[PDB]
Amino acid sequence: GSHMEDFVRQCFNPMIVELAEKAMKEYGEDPKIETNKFAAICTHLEVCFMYSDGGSKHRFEIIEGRDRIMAWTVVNSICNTTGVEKPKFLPDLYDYKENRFIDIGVTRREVHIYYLEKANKIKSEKTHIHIFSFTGEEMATKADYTLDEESRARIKTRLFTIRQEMASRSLWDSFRQ
């Protein structure tokens, strides 16, 4: 029974927590053991939902937060109706305005380290990458940030608030691992 686990459950909304638990069990991981991974997964989910809230009404197809099988079905429907090429790793959204997948990442290192890692890893050239850090930095493919500045600013503010809440509990150092 860890502090981090109880922190996560009071820090994130129950819908987010439930999705994160589902996602971990589906990969055979235990939220009560891998408590830093639990916190990171909830964080990534909340950022993706906040990001999809920034678009105009029908701008995005949300991929993240679905069962893995259904998430790939929807990806397949998108590729088959748009011609866009199928990503090799599951992206988080599809942008119907810019006609591209978005892979969103949240990092405790300099943004460009994780940006570069994701770039090399998906190697699916056309997929848009957008990284946020817990210190207010962001980095996106082609310097095209997709959303208006306010919708990105509120994501940065929420991430620093998560960081402060962990630090106030002496949990930030082992999370930033």
Ligand SMILES: *S(=O)(=O)OC[C@H]1O[C@@H](n2ccc(N)nc2=O)[C@H](O)[C@@H]1OP(=O)(O)OC[C@H]1O[C@@H](n2cnc3c(N)ncnc32)[C@H](O)[C@@H]1O
């Ligand atoms: S998410 O898309 O918001 O990702 C959040 C964190 O998960 C890491 N990640 C993502 C995808 C894949 N395939 N692997 C993966 O490791 C990602 O790097 C994000 O972590 P941070 O960049 O904030 O770093 C946190 C600490 O975790 C350790 N770490 C991360 N990645 C590592 C790899 N590949 N090898 C070894 N250790 C790794 C570091 O201690 C890091 O400071």
